[PDB]
Amino acid sequence: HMSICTSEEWQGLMQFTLPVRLCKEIELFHFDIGPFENMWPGIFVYMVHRSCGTSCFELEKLCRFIMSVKKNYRRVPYHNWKHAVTVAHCMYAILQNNHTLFTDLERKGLLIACLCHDLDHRGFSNSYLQKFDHPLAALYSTSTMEQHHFSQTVSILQLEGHNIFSTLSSSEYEQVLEIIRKAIIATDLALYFGNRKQLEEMYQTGSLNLNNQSHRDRVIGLMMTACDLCSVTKLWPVTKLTANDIYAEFWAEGDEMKKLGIQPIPMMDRDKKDEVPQGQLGFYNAVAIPCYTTLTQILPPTEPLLKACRDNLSQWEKVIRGE
Numbered sequence: 528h529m530s531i532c533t534s535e536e537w538q539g540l541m542q543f544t545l546p547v548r549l550c551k552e553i554e555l556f557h558f559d560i561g562p563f564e565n566m567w568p569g570i571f572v573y574m575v576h577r578s579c580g581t582s583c584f585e586l587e588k589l590c591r592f593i594m595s596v597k598k599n600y601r602r603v604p605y606h607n608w609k610h611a612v613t614v615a616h617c618m619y620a621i622l623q624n625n626h627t628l629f630t631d632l633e634r635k636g637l638l639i640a641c642l643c644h645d646l647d648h649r650g651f652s653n654s655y656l657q658k659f660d661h662p663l664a665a666l667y668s669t670s671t672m673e674q675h676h677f678s679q680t681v682s683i684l685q686l687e688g689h690n691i692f693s694t695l696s697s698s699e700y701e702q703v704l705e706i707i708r709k710a711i712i713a714t715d716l717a718l719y720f721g722n723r724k725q726l727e728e729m730y731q732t733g734s735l736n737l738n739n740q741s742h743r744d745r746v747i748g749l750m751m752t753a754c755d756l757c758s759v760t761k762l763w764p765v766t767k768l769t770a771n772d773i774y775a776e777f778w779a780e781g782d783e784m785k786k787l788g789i790q791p792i793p794m795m796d797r798d799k800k801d802e803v804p805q806g807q808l809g810f811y812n813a814v815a816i817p818c819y820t821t822l823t824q825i826l827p828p829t830e831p832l833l834k835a836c837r838d839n840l841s842q843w844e845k846v847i848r849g850e
């Protein structure tokens with residue numbers, strides 16, 4: 528079952544007007560949604576209307592969908608409503624800078640998938656649920672949470688007056704639900720490493736073709752990872768604060784493992800905070816930097832994401848050195 532938004536919630540969203548000061552700021556990659564909480568659902572409406580159109584979705588149905596997605600996001604330290612809008616904004620920025628490379632159906636599907644990619648996240652990783660035999664792990668063997676996030680997306684759409692894709696043709700509706708499915712599954716970090724390695728091989732050899740559906744799905748998959756990790760592409764104080772939020776969620780998972788007598792990995796151990804800057808260095812070198820490097824190679828206008836990630840790596844390197 529899903530939590531439904533109140534009549535006052537979507538009615539207020541329909542009446543929302545985005546300030547002219549922000550419409551110029553929202554187009555840039557390094558944009559931080561953080562200081563505009565009350566404007567987050569309205570920011571998404573504006574983003575949808577600028578990427579797709581003012582009549583792509585019925586304004587009533589769209590406002591109902593957004594506010595109901597918000598209510599189904601848990602009050603965890605990182606994988607919350609704030610994360611969803613940050614991921615959706617990064618997708619908007621990528622789509623805006625490479626608009627014609629993607630179809631109308633893909634732009635609509637990817638912005639919706641981004642807002643729904645971590646729906647009903649309980650604050651626990653896939654390895655935790657699989658190790659401690661959580662009901663979700665029995666229902667989904669691999670990409671546990673990601674398979675659950677897609678199921679919750681379908682459920683929100685199945686609600687009365689929430690089906691934003693009902694006006695699409697049967698074949699297009701089937702296509703948008705498959706774009707969303709593959710995009711949400713791609714946010715499982717375990718799948719990223721193999722996906723980036725294949726794309727690097729396809730790019731280097733010059734065999735990468737955007738007309739090829741298998742290559743298209745791989746590119747979209749990398750875009751999903753790049754959006755999911757975009758907190759590493761913000762200004763250093765924003766990046767620094769977001770790191771505290773994800774570690775509060777990692778440490779809480781470790782605290783749960785400790786209650787069962789199992790010692791977590793240093794990254795999930797709050798008694799091992801000193802190892803966080805070195806752990807961050809490893810994450811940028813092996814995960815973040817290669818992601819944005821490959822993304823820049825395939826989609827050159829995404830270059831500012833790699834630059835901002837490199838700037839934050841240099842900042843973590845200054846922490847280790849003592850500077």
Ligand SMILES: CC(C)(CO)n1c(=O)[nH]c2c3cccnc3n(-c3ccccc3)c(=O)c21
Pocket residue numbers: 714715716755756757758759769770773807810
């Ligand atoms: C990008 C972020 C949040 C920056 O603070 N970050 C980090 O520093 N370490 C990690 C991190 C470390 C280990 C595993 N996953 C991580 N993810 C993650 C979590 C869920 C789904 C996909 C990726 C991050 O976003 C992240």
Ligand SMILES: [Mg+2]
Pocket residue numbers: 644645672714715
């Ligand atoms: Mg996720």
Ligand SMILES: [Zn+2]
Pocket residue numbers: 610614644645714755
């Ligand atoms: Zn995420």
